[PDB]
Design a protein around this nucleic acid. Structure first.
Ligand SMILES: [Zn+2]
Ligand SMILES: [Zn+2]
Lengths: 928, 187, 73, 186
RNA sequence: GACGAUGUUCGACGAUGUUCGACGACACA
RNA sequence: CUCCUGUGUCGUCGAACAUCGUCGAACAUCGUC
């Protein structure tokens, strides 16, 4: 009939066995992902394609394969225009056939365009499926994974198949798309060359490319003089970049002739430069990215150029051998005695950087030269044994000794008198609400290395740079009210001067020895030396002995004294200005006593219209944090040095931060390993880089929530214009638009309020917007973490509170309770009673069991446990009353022991304040 | 405390006041002697308090000088320790393999991660399971890092010497894992 | 109190006693003791925490350090 | 505060001042009695403050020594107080398995390895006499830790494997009797 | 020169408050 | 021979400053003889 004639016309010449998928008219495919930008809409969303009539092709045996004949029905002007633009690009092999024809649909010559043999999905569909991930709505991703033999439905039958921590085989399942994505990139470069040669101008979007690589839809292309065409590939490459490392697109570049069926390239073992290789890779895959790429980020022009080129370097460094990164040693003669010291560094992100003050043939070593030579891992690794540690997958450098060290953790010390007292006061009964859950868990020798091995969660993550270097502007706006810069050595405030000094300096003393041995001139000289040289140091992981509720080990990282000593002078002014500011987003240094909790909460709630509360968590926050976001945090913190440091000084300070905190050599046991990335616990600026990263992820979730909605359905005109300009400032503008950055910052601060501490946040958002999709929800955080953090955030760890009279469900391990405090209603933080009782019953030293020597211990625990006395659950208040009665008993028996052992009274006339709730109650009221 | 000018005035005014109170004269002179006794005792207490201030300044100086004589001691001690450590670890370092791989580089600048990989004369393999041992260090000699190593002194997690014949498939649940194999680069 | 809190506190005290007898100097024995202790502390059923307490106490009694007739007098 | 020499001076001064203000004298008398009270009260405050400082320093130095002594006692008596605490709170549990194990181990029937929990794992316990063997074991089943175990083999002191029908009252003195029995959990 | 009166001046003492420093402890990220 | 960074609170001790009071004692002014 008519449909059969249409089908035979659609086949035409090819031996195409077509079956009418849908019917003989438009098919209206369900919700393909488009990347559109016109005068009305703008965004990367899922729209409703409705002007096509698809036919699926079958081969012999009449079973269906993955090739469709999409037939459009557009007007005559567009028909002739696309025919003219296709008659030029027809010779390109990265272009699907088109076969323009005319067919009498209703009686009058309707013109059709029939692109031939195109895959069910496009590249925009793959990118949207992997970037906006929903663990219960991922049908397109499953179909794409199955259709290309990455896996099979029995894989999705299992649990947590999508998770990156549980089931890390999804990395291999994804990497099975790498060669397909890489062939798509090569076909894109071919198409760009054809466009330039034919003199065609047009914007390349992702939704106009198959999952084979072929291009089509020459609708908005303009013809020009041949040889002077210009493709626009900003949105294409930028939206594509996060999946170039997820699917390991450039794995085939490690092989000989760049094909996976050949051996690896046996790179020269002494080679460390790899700059011509990086330029070749760029010119091969990103040829028409029209912004200068510096392989070595030491030649960059500012911090935005550093972020750009470091993104490209963190992609290209996955091709080169891992033994070619790290310090670049060199033979130095210290008075006719040959040393081996570091005179450079080769970063995976910052390229190659050489020290400027390298002096061969020295005569004598001063104190600061001895420091920089004893802190380098060069002399410690060049002299130690080789090491092949089969317990981990992390790179192992050398073993410093002749044998491995297996460090264990001990159990806690049972305080039996407090426990007997508690169970005499009617505690710890069967089926009670308050029970012991926090203990001192013991560990065996295999705990330190099994906890270091969790760095396997830090994968190379390439970031969408066009949105990362806008999110960085909004974050910098979040950090404007502070005052930072470099300080002299005599202005540095160091507290706890009797702590360890890292490795190897802990063989000779604590930090006091090295702060007293060095005059202020020596410290200033060392600091001014780290601005022209890279000092790679060694951190030391060692297990933590503290009370917790989970039986997993906890390590801490002790960074050297050189690194802390100079990082203090760099950052301490800004860090103190952050910790001494109230009313801001980053609530660091704000106390919870004397009405501080109420003030913080009232500041979060500030002006939001339909306020709900919300809080999330980062799974494996320190292990899985990508290196690009840590470099971004460092640059945002160092943006305060616009007058004290030049550009090269700031770059060398960034290089030092990287080489010392980000990818340094970790000594776990008695052996040196290579840390892939993350955050060092003992870094000077950890609780603040964490806050910058927190705000970065929240702003990213917000731009992903606003750009991924149908702009045709946003009822408000202001928000529609704001989404249009947001897309245009991400992917169509290279410069910084300070007016729109201020406008988006105001929008966020009005509709998405935050209370950020280090990787702990509480948000008071506008619930109507979040339901319409104009601010971030929990699903947007889940998606952003999946594609920008390589973790899966389970919604069982996040929370939401619709009633603001109850505070946050949890913030800084404290719950919130609205109590009446003298005609006023305030918010008070109360802990977990199990935590306070566990701190009472289990101590970490045998002398803390005596009690009478440790009454201030229980005074502090009762200060922390006071607000439980306002709880409607009676056992929660009984906790505080128990602590008070025990303090009284402790004082009584101490007085008895003093009167009997010795023979003198110890009234003290002032110890009766701790038995009564007035002290602790005044601890939670505003001063005056 | 008698080393001050006002102490003599104090003693003299006290003596005059005593000689006056031993007679009991009219109040016009007695009050003036009390005023002189003041001026004396007031300047006396002034200079005595100033003497206490200067003595405390001297004590602060003494403590500040007894602390520097220990800070310099500690500085010299840690300097000696650091450079002794450098010169000691350097003696197990300088050889022909290092001087050979450095002299092959473009400008003498080689990565650090290949210094022990190509110059170290002793390997240490830590092996968690038995299958890892079977696939890694089977036999007395094995190949790693493009070299040929020679097993000697395999020990266990307790640092007790394990014999090569005890590492079997059936005896593996009887010895403490991991085992730390030590090898020597065969020439 | 309850028979669970007592069991957890006794397992804490028992692993302390074992650690003082230099069991940490045996990799296998210390690993087993740590496993039993951490499993008693996370237990929910009282009928299994008692089995693991049996196992841990049997680790203690197989040595010859603690004179048992004087302690249990 | 009443034992110092200034006590009598301050008391007499205050009493005379009250007696004089109760009299209603001229203005010079008020100021002169105030002067007496002034100097007396001032010197009394002086030596009383001296005594307060001395007593506070004494109490501080006493409590520091007390804390030192108690800390040393705690650190010294460890490893001997932890064991008695452990057994004190093990007797309080009053379990039927732990008490059985404790009683056997105090009689001599100590195990040789960790008591297993699985259905087919091996257990080896020492048995020092026949009467200890007589009540813990009948026939083949071996009752230990309040559970039934099935004997596999019994050895002597010199690892000379012995059967089950040979262990008896008359046949007891023909062995050395640290018989290491072996069994699996039934 | 004395009488009376106020206040100014230092030093010791007591207290309060403020701020800094040293040591100990507790909590949190 | 091992225990990191930062924040915040409590306790003890010490120092400096200010105010008030306990005061001791010089006088700078006023009225009178
Ligand atoms: Zn650049
Ligand atoms: Zn600066």
């Amino acid at each position: 009939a008519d449909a059969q004639s249409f089908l035979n016309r659609v086949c035409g010449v090819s031996a195409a066995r077509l079956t009418p998928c849908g019917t003989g008219t438009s098919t209206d495919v369900v919700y393909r992902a488009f990347d559109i930008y016109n005068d009305k809409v703008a965004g990367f969303a899922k729209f409703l394609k409705t002007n096509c009539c698809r036919f699926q092709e079958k081969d012999e045996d009449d079973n269906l394969i993955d090739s469709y004949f999409v037939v459009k029905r557009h007007t005559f002007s567009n028909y002739q225009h696309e025919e003219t633009i296709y008659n030029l690009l027809k010779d390109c092999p990265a272009v699907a056939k088109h076969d323009f024809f005319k067919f009498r649909i209703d009686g009058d010559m309707v013109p059709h365009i029939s692109r031939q043999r195109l895959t069910k999905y496009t590249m925009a569909d793959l990118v949207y499926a992997l970037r906006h991930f929903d663990e219960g709505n991922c049908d397109t991703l499953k179909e794409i994974l199955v259709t290309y033999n990455c896996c099979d439905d029995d894989y999705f039958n299992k649990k947590d198949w999508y998770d990156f921590v549980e089931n890390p085989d999804i990395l291999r399942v994804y990497a099975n798309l790498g060669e397909r994505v890489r062939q798509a990139l090569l076909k894109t470069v071919q198409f760009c060359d054809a466009m330039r040669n034919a003199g065609i101008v047009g914007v390349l979007t992702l939704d106009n490319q198959d999952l084979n690589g072929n291009w089509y839809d020459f609708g908005d292309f303009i013809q020009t003089t041949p040889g002077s065409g210009v493709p626009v590939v900003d949105s294409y490459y930028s939206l594509l970049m996060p999946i170039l490392t997820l699917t390991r697109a450039l794995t085939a570049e490690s092989h000989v002739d760049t094909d996976l069926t050949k051996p690896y390239i046996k790179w020269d073992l002494l080679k460390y430069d790899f700059t011509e290789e990086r330029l070749k890779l760029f010119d091969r895959y990103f040829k028409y990215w029209d912004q200068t790429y510096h392989p070595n980020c030491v030649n960059c022009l500012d911090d935005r150029c550093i972020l750009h080129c470091a993104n490209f370097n963190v992609l290209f460094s996955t091709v080169f051998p891992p033994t070619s990164f790290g310090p670049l040693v060199r033979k130095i003669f210290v008075d006719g005695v040959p040393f081996v010291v570091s005179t450079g560094y080769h970063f995976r992100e910052l390229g190659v950087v050489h020290n400027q003050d390298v002096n061969l043939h020295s005569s004598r070593l001063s104190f600061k030269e001895l420091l920089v030579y004893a802190a380098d891992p060069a002399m410690h690794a060049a002299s130690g044994n080789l090491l092949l540690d089969k317990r981990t997958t992390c790179f192992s450098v050398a073993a410093l000794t002749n044998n491995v060290a297996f460090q264990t953790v001990k159990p806690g010390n049972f305080n039996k008198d407090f426990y007997d007292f508690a169970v005499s006061k009617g505690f710890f009964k069967e089926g009670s609400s308050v029970e012991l859950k926090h203990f001192f868990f013991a560990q065996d020798g295999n705990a330190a290395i099994s906890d270091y091995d969790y760095y396997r969660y830090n994968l190379p993550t390439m970031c969408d740079i066009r949105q990362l270097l806008f999110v960085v502007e909004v974050v910098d706006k979040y950090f404007d009210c502070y005052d930072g810069g470099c300080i002299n050595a005599n202005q540095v405030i160091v507290n706890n001067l009797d702590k360890s000094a890292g490795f190897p300096f802990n063989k000779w003393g604590k930090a006091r020895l090295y702060y007293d041995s060095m005059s202020y001139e020596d410290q200033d000289a060392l600091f001014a030396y780290t601005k022209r040289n890279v000092i790679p140091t060694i951190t030391q992981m060692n297990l933590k002995y503290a009370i917790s509720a989970k039986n997993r080990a906890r390590t801490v990282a002790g960074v050297s004294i050189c690194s802390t000593m100079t990082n203090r002078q760099f950052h301490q002014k800004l860090l103190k200005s952050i910790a001494a500011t109230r009313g801001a987003t980053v609530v660091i240094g704000t106390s919870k006593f004397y009405g501080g909790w109420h003030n913080m909460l009232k500041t979060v709630y500030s002006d939001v219209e339909n306020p709900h509360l919300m809080g999330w968590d980062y799974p494996k926050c320190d292990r899985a944090m990508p290196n690009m976001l840590r470099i971004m945090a460092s640059l945002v913190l160092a943006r305060k040095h616009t007058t004290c440091c030049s550009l090269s000084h700031r770059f060398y300070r960034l290089a030092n931060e990287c080489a010392q905190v980000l990818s340094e050599m970790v000594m776990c046991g008695g052996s040196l390993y290579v840390k892939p990335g993350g955050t060092s616990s003992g870094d000077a600026t950890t609780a603040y880089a964490n806050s910058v990263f927190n705000i970065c992820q929240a702003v990213t979730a917000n731009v992903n929530a606003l750009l991924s909605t149908d702009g045709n359905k946003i009822a408000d005109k202001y928000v529609r214009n704001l989404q249009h300009r947001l897309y245009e400032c991400l992917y169509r503008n290279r410069d910084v638009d300070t007016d729109f950055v201020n406008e988006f910052y105001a929008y966020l601060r009005k509709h998405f309020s935050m209370m950020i501490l280090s990787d702990d946040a509480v948000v008071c958002f506008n619930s109507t917007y979040a339901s319409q999709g104009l601010v971030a929800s929990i699903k947007n955080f889940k998606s952003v973490l999946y594609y920008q953090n390589n973790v899966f955030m389970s919604e069982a760890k996040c929370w939401t509170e619709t009633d603001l009279t109850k505070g946050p469900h949890e913030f800084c391990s404290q719950h919130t309770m609205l109590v009446k405090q003298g005609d006023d209603y305030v918010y008070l933080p109360y802990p977990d009673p199990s935590r306070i009782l566990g701190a009472g019953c289990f101590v970490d030293d045998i002398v803390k069991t005596d009690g009478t020597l440790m009454i201030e211990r229980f005074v502090s625990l009762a200060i922390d446990a006071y607000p439980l006395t306002k709880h409607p659950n009676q056992e929660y208040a009984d906790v505080f009353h128990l602590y008070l009665q025990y303090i009284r008993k402790l004082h009584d028996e101490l007085t008895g022991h003093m009167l009997d052992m010795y023979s003198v009274m110890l009234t003290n006339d002032n110890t009766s304040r701790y038995w009564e709730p007035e002290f602790y109650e005044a601890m939670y009221t505003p001063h005056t | 405390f008698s080393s001050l000018p006002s102490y003599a005035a104090f003693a003299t005014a006290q003596e005059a006041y005593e000689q006056a109170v031993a007679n009991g004269d009219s109040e016009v002179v007695l009050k003036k002697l009390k005023k002189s006794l003041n001026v004396a005792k007031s300047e006396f207490d002034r200079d005595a308090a100033m003497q206490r201030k200067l003595e405390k300044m001297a004590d602060q100086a003494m403590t500040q000088m007894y602390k520097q004589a220990r800070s310099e001691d500690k500085r010299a001690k840690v300097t000696s320790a650091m450079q002794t450590m450098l010169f000691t670890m350097l003696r197990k370092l300088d050889n022909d393999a290092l001087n050979n791989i450095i002299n092959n580089a473009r400008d003498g600048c080689v990565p650090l991660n290949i210094i022990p990989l190509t110059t170290a004369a002793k390997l240490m393999v830590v092996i968690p399971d038995y299958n890892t041992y079977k696939n890694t260090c089977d036999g007395t000699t094995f190949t790693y890092a493009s070299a040929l190593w020679e097993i000697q002194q395999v020990v266990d997690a307790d640092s007790k010497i394990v014999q090569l014949s005890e590492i079997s498939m059936d005896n593996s649940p009887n010895l403490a894992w991991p085992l730390i194999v030590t090898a020597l680069r065969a020439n | 109190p309850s028979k669970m809190s007592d069991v957890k506190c006794t397992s804490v005290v028992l692993l302390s006693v074992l650690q003082q007898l230099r069991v940490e100097s045996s990799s296998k024995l210390w690993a087993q003791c740590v496993q039993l202790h951490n499993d008693i502390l996370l237990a929910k059923d009282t009928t299994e925490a008692f089995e693991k307490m049996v196992s841990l106490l049997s680790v203690l009694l197989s040595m010859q350090g603690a004179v048992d007739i004087n302690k249990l007098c």
